[PDB]
Amino acid sequence: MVMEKPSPLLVGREFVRQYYTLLNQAPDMLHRFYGKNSSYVHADAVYGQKEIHRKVMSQNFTNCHTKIRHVDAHATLNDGVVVQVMGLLSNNNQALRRFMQTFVLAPEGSVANKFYVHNDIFRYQDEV
Amino acid sequence: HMVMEKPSPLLVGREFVRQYYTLLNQAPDMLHRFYGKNSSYVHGGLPADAVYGQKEIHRKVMSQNFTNCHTKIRHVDAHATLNDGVVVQVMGLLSNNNQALRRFMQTFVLAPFYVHNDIFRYQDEVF
């Protein structure tokens, strides 16, 4: 069975599902989403899979619970997809906190329809 | 009167946001000039869908009747993205036409600047 390829919205929503699920289950594996040019800010940005992994591990994600309230995802430059996420996130069984998170997904360039995260920008509302 | 080093993505983002919200207050009828044929735009509403291209974006902006806007930009972060673009994340408060001050979350993608994507949501329509 063949079906037309996913829209940017489906791509974005599916990525969001993958990302937050992995953040709960095995945050030590999150680094697979990133490449050498990737930028992560969760505060100076850190770059590349190695440094991003280090930053993710330093946050001590444990039993991370996420409720996504809205996802916007749109085609952007050079076949990328820009994603805006609004939701609530909990870590270490503390209270849920509202956040927004902006992603830019970019074609990975070696596999059809495969994307990596070129930009990952997260901010809690309470800190702002 | 000199040649300055190219501004970092953060200065580009911050300066763009300044110009955008100033214009939103001074002349919203001119906001459409930021956008091109492949540009996406959404500005909250009930969630309302985005529109594409300068003509449809202008119509949308006009329909929103921006007037006597008060904007408080609490945070702006901006980073280099694909093909020397800049992705901007904005958090702040916006009051239109002397109505309620409402918290918003916004994302721009700027391309070498014009606006490729403008995603704005009010928190109170989502949370």
Numbering used by the authors:
A (entry chain A): 1 to 42, 52 to 137
B (entry chain B): 0 to 45, 51 to 116, 124 to 138
Extract from the study:
Ras GTPase Activating Protein SH3 Domain Binding Protein (G3BP), a 52 kDa protein highly overexpressed in various cancer tumors, has in the last couple of years proved to be a significant cancer marker protein and a potential drug target. G3BP is involved in several cellular functions and is implicated for example in stress granule assembly, RNA metabolism and hereby cell motility, nuclear transportation and NFkappaB, Ras and Wnt signaling. In addition to the PxxP motifs, G3BP also contains glutamine- and glycine rich regions, an RNA recognition motif (RRM) and an N-terminal NTF2-like domain ranging from residue 11–134 in human G3BP1.
In addition to chain A and B, 289 water molecules and one glycerol molecule were included in the model. The structure was refined using seven TLS groups to a final Rfree value of 23% and structure validation showed good overall stereo-chemistry with no Ramachandran outliers. Chain A and chain B are almost identical with rmsd of 0.453. The N-terminal residues are held in place by burying methionine residues 1 and 3 in the hydrophobic ridge. Furthermore, a salt bridge exists between Glu4 and His79. Despite being a probable crystal artifact, the binding of the N-terminal residues to a symmetry related molecule could indicate a possible ligand binding site. Although it remains to be experimentally validated, we speculate that the G3BP1 interaction partner, Caprin-1, might be recognized at this site.
